[PDB]
Ligand binder design. Structure first.
Ligand SMILES: [Mg+2]
Ligand SMILES: [Mg+2]
Ligand SMILES: [Zn+2]
Ligand SMILES: [Zn+2]
Ligand SMILES: [Zn+2]
Ligand SMILES: [Zn+2]
Length: 85
DNA sequence: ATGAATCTATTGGTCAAGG
DNA sequence: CCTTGACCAATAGATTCAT
């Protein structure tokens, strides 16, 4: 069958349906080790990891919580979000 | 001064090929 | 099957643009 039990969307295989269904169940088994990010698809965690460090970018660490960032403006957004005081 | 438009960086949903 | 990753829309914040 490979059809979503929640919205009826049809798929060509079981695994794409499994990933899709997590958007109805809220399940997010893939959790980043370097921040609170969590996701339903393993390659999504891989892509998110680029924001903590990537070839061709430096690493800017948060002076307060030590979290690493490959993009400095993202570290600035992190400062505003988590360490606003 | 204010809001619309438009950038960046990043993420969510989708789809399909590699292992 | 699980893994992988390209692609396109959406999102949040920053900035520019128009008036
Ligand atoms: Mg499919
Ligand atoms: Mg591929
Ligand atoms: Zn569904
Ligand atoms: Zn199936
Ligand atoms: Zn993370
Ligand atoms: Zn921090």
């Amino acid at each position: 069958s490979d059809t979503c039990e929640y919205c009826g969307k049809v798929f060509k295989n079981c695994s794409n349906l499994t990933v899709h269904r997590r958007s109805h169940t809220g399940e997010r088994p893939y959790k980043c080790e370097l921040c609170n990010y969590a996701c339903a698809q393993s390659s999504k965690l891989t892509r998110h990891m680029k924001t903590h460090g990537q070839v061709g970018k430096d690493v800017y660490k948060c002076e307060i919580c030590k979290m690493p960032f490959s993009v400095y403006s993202t570290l600035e957004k992190h400062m505003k979000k988590w360490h606003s005081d």
